[PDB]
Structure 1
Amino acid sequence: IIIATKNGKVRGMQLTVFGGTVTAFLGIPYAQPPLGRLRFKKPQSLTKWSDIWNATKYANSCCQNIDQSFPGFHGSEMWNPNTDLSEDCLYLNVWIPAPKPKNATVLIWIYGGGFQTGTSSLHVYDGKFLARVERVIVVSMNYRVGALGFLALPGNPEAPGNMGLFDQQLALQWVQKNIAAFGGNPKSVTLFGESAGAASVSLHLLSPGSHSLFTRAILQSGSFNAPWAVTSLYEARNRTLNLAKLTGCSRENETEIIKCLRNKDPQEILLNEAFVVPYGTPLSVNFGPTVDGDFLTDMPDILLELGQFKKTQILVGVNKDEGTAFLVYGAPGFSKDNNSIITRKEFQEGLKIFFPGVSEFGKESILFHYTDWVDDQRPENYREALGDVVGDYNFICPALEFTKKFSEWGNNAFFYYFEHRSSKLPWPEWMGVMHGYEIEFVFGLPLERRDQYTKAEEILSRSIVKRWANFAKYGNPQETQNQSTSWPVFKSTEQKYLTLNTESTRIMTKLRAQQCRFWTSFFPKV
């Protein structure tokens, strides 16, 4: 139950899973707590300890604003931190199979949450099912989010930006130096993540300091080229200064602004993050990745376009209804508690909420592309169009474009289209196959026959788990035994992708081709 790591010994705990055993190491620190002088700076190396570190419970989650929009509602509160918030949050978790493996492929999870929220201790990120069922080792880490993680004064090591990305990177580094002691193969490391985590994974494909820290990559519902994923240097500065004046920390020296921001309490910095932008959206990322010239050497669209990234296999995909969850966080006429049949003027009003700084002509162009109906008497027409607008613009089309352009440089790519709505899903049926609700299938929670999934869901989760682990171990997301559809590689010409569902798993081509031509060629110009 004790493992000697390069900075000290850690005690784990035993878990009984599906009539077996998994060894969990919860809450191992991987960096100096970024407190006091260290707030806003890159993570610093952790010095040795002599005792046994008791890694027997999830550590603190990083400071963050909570989603309070639906108190008592499991659909929202399942994403809120299930652990004490604190600035002292740089910890990671390790699940290893029992008995101890000899050279196990490692899966590293990076959670999302708009780069402002999230925590590896969530129930839907529990890595014990994967370790039990597929004998991979699962690693997950907490990284700084919001201004405490991504405040940018470009060039200034007091607040250089991308700290949360560097938190992740130091964690990857920790797996490089230590995972063999747990029986993992540091040469067989697959990053996977969802939404902002997925975008984080894609930026590690771009960052040279990460190229030697992982083998392969899996991108669930996110990528760096998404419109929400990279903050400009203009707006980062404007946001850093609006935070300064909002707290009385306006100075001229710039480094003395950071020193001033370092003596505010975490709460005061969190309360003011909301207002650093004049007009926010349900997809706002007040403080996110920037081109810091350190983690990220150039604007990522250029690096993607010009082949500047780690050459390796990727697994990419999206969910059928990425956009719906955001509609009841601001769009008029929408509610999780009715069927949100909205009118044309409500739709038009919704676009003003999702596209605030966009010209009247840009908003008309969106209306025009999404409102020539196959049948113009359906009352749901505007309700579904707005969800598709948000999903296509923010998730599906950028993921497709990332995959096309990444595969143009000769690496195998696999694209999925997840379209199963979970039987237990707390949100209403009109929200469909929502953002983030493939995650529990990936982590194998339906394999738990107790907690209420249908048997079809167990089968779907069991195949996805196999496909993910085969992708991590061997670079190829096939299920070779049960007579399963082969998953073809995604090539920029055919654009074949795989649908995942409980009924018929099928090979399809050119997902949302009409919508994505509008978003990826036309709309970037308006």
Structure 2
Amino acid sequence: NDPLVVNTDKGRIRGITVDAPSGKKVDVWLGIPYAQPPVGPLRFRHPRPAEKWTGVLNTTTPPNSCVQIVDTVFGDFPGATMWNPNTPLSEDCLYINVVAPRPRPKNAAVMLWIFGGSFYSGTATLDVYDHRALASEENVIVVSLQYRVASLGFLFLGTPEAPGNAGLFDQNLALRWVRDNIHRFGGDPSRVTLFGESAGAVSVSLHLLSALSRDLFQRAILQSGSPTAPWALVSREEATLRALRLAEAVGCPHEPSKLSDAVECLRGKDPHVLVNNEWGTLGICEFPFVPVVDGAFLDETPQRSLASGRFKKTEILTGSNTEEGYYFIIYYLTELLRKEEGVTVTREEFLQAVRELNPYVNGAARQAIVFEYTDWTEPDNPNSNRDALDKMVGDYHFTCNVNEFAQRYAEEGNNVYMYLYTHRSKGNPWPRWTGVMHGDEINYVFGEPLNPTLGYTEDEKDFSRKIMRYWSNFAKTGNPNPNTASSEFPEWPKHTAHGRHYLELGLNTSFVGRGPRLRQCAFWKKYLPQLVAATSN
């Protein structure tokens, strides 16, 4: 009997044994189908489960990537190409990958990754997500899934043929596949931890809300993403207009009264033409096709679920990086924050950037933003004015929403663990002033430093082991801390509703603070909303 052949509920599949960069071996099944290819009449619609197959399906090749724009702003710059699809683009992209340790466990914990990329880009096949180190160093089953992105995943028109949230229904079906099958690979289907970063963390958090996902997993890890972020959802009314704008841009009928004509034309267009025409006039951290409240995956806004306690009762581990904003500013204000060493921002340039980065608020609100994000020890310092741009974008779009989500989870009696990730890799290829950007922790979570052919220092290898241990301790037990307190593994205290402690994740540190950034988060969540109310005569 061949242990690399596995009989799934739809047929048999064949995997392959491979090496970790770690020296240990793992078994691997790449490209398991979990839905019918969502092509032809099935475009924009919810996935159908996969049809049974006879024989043994060879699942040994990384699957196709879902159709998406390719980023060429910086050419072959490694900081950018690491996030571009590394497998062929196709609408036939609904696949799962499974990676098991050796020897195969019986009832191991299962860590299921959901990638980010602003709901219009990303793929489970990226080298930075390679599953082998995490599985073999921590003895967990590691799973990843594809889901449709961009208008192909999130077109909404309020009609049955464009119902919204297709990409979320994709993730739900993959979750169902895992519960029905992961025990055949040595995983315990009652010990599934979802983890994701960015739009993948939003996705995870939406599974903490949906009644369709409630019983499909055990706990959740959310890296730099929360469902209260202003980019995480779009109203149904605005989604309908963006879809019609897309129909216009590609030459289709676009009348609000005959939505049948628009969907049918859109189903005939080339998929690359669709994703390449989504980009109208949108501000920073505004993505055109994202989740909506549809009635079935969600039937109320996340903030209404949070206010009422209608969310899954379980532990969560979540956090932010210190420079969440720069990445998006680098791609949005391409004249101001050039990708070069030694960039600084003048006070006059800062005052203009504030208007460009918060284009919807009135003058009085802009003044408050300026006051809140000025270094009053040295108001004109050109480093301070550059950093202030990162902090106002990162606080509003990322950090403060993570805080809000963790706070409501803790108030309802759930164990919460909060981190602030502060480590900058020695080999970071971005300019020195960018600090610790959005996404930097992913390399350490997946154990890339344990690949000796990359350039990581010995200390960074140790740091990556610590982080994989915290993450997988959390997946296995609900608590990232080990049993015997260690000098290498500082105590990570709970994030309580009143205390709001967080652990700083970095090389030479075990600092525990509160928040992070409680005062700036109160500015966005409490002060600025009431000032906008008072001044909207």
Same fold (TM over 0.5): yes
Please name the residue that 1:364 is paired with: 367
CA distance in 1, matches of 2:288, 2:327: 19
Contact 2:347–2:382 at 8 Å: present in 1 too?
no
Choose from 244, 258, 274 the match for 1:241: 244
> What is the count of residue pairs matched by the alignment?
522
Per the TM alignment, residue 378 of structure 1 is displaced from its structure 2 partner at its CA by 2.9
Secondary structure at the residue paired with 1:61?
A: coil
Per the TM alignment, residue 490 of structure 1 is displaced from its structure 2 partner at its CA by 0.5
Please name the residue that 1:507 is paired with: 512
Equivalences for 1:12-31 in 2 at 5 Å?
Answer: 12-17=15-20, 18-31=22-35
What does the per-residue CA deviation read over 1:46-91, in whole Å, with 9 as the maximum and x for residues that have no partner?
Answer: 1100021111111110011111110010001110111111111101
CA distance in 2, matches of 1:490, 1:446: 29
Per the TM alignment, residue 281 of structure 1 is displaced from its structure 2 partner at its CA by 2.8
Q: 1:141 to 1:524 in 2, by over 3 A?
A: farther
Please name the residue that 2:304 is paired with: 302
Choose from 321, 327, 330 the match for 1:325: 327
Per the TM alignment, residue 395 of structure 1 is displaced from its structure 2 partner at its CA by 0.6
CA distance in 2, matches of 1:418, 1:460: 12
Secondary structure at the residue paired with 2:214?
A: helix
Choose from 478, 482, 486 the match for 1:479: 482
What does the per-residue CA deviation read over 1:392-436, in whole Å, with 9 as the maximum and x for residues that have no partner?
Answer: 111101100110011111110000000000112110110000100
Please name the residue that 1:498 is paired with: 503
What does the per-residue CA deviation read over 1:235-273, in whole Å, with 9 as the maximum and x for residues that have no partner?
Answer: 101101111222222243212211111011112211221
Matched, 1:73 2:57: no
Please name the residue that 2:535 is paired with: none
Contact 1:330–1:353 at 8 Å: present in 2 too?
no
CA distance in 2, matches of 1:28, 1:520: 43
Please name the residue that 1:48 is paired with: 52
Please name the residue that 1:453 is paired with: 456
Per the TM alignment, residue 377 of structure 1 is displaced from its structure 2 partner at its CA by 5.2
Secondary structure at the residue paired with 1:318?
A: strand
- Sequence identity of aligned pairs in percent? 48
Per the TM alignment, residue 372 of structure 1 is displaced from its structure 2 partner at its CA by 4.2
CA distance in 2, matches of 1:502, 1:455: 11
CA distance in 2, matches of 1:2, 1:180: 14
Matched, 1:521 2:526: yes
Per the TM alignment, residue 450 of structure 1 is displaced from its structure 2 partner at its CA by 3.2
Matched letter for residue 253 of structure 2: C
Choose from 404, 419, 423 the match for 1:401: 404
Per the TM alignment, residue 357 of structure 1 is displaced from its structure 2 partner at its CA by 2.5
Per the TM alignment, residue 340 of structure 1 is displaced from its structure 2 partner at its CA by 2.1
CA distance in 2, matches of 1:325, 1:371: 21
319-328 vs 140-149, which moves further: 319-328
CA distance in 1, matches of 2:321, 2:383: 20
Choose from 192, 206, 226 the match for 1:189: 192
What does the per-residue CA deviation read over 1:331-385, in whole Å, with 9 as the maximum and x for residues that have no partner?
Answer: 2421111322111232222223322223233222211111142333532111000
Equivalences for 1:349-428 in 2 at 5 Å?
Answer: 349-376=352-379, 378-428=381-431
Matched, 1:170 2:173: yes
Q: Which runs of 5+ in 2 are unaligned?
A: 533-537
Equivalences for 1:70-469 in 2 at 5 Å?
Answer: 70-154=74-158, 156-247=159-250, 248-251=252-255, 252-275=257-280, 279-331=281-333, 332-376=335-379, 378-469=381-472
Matched letter for residue 389 of structure 2: L
Contact 2:284–2:328 at 8 Å: present in 1 too?
yes
CA distance in 2, matches of 1:365, 1:124: 40
Matched letter for residue 305 of structure 1: A
Choose from 39, 61, 78 the match for 2:65: 61
Contact 1:373–1:381 at 8 Å: present in 2 too?
no
Per the TM alignment, residue 140 of structure 1 is displaced from its structure 2 partner at its CA by 0.4
CA distance in 2, matches of 1:130, 1:510: 29
Secondary structure at the residue paired with 1:380?
A: helix
CA distance in 1, matches of 2:126, 2:313: 32
240-249 vs 454-463, which moves further: 240-249
Matched letter for residue 71 of structure 2: D
What does the per-residue CA deviation read over 1:452-509, in whole Å, with 9 as the maximum and x for residues that have no partner?
Answer: 1111111111011011111001000113443332111111211111001010112111
CA distance in 2, matches of 1:524, 1:323: 21
Q: 1:458 to 1:260 in 2, by over 3 A?
A: same
Secondary structure at the residue paired with 2:319?
A: strand
Matched letter for residue 330 of structure 1: Y
Per the TM alignment, residue 234 of structure 1 is displaced from its structure 2 partner at its CA by 2.0
Secondary structure at the residue paired with 2:133?
A: helix
Matched letter for residue 268 of structure 2: N
CA distance in 2, matches of 1:229, 1:441: 25
Matched letter for residue 104 of structure 2: K
Contact 2:31–2:61 at 8 Å: present in 1 too?
yes
TM-score, normalised relative to structure 1:
0.97
Secondary structure at the residue paired with 2:163?
A: coil
Q: 1:12 to 1:111 in 2, by over 3 A?
A: same
CA distance in 2, matches of 1:375, 1:358: 26
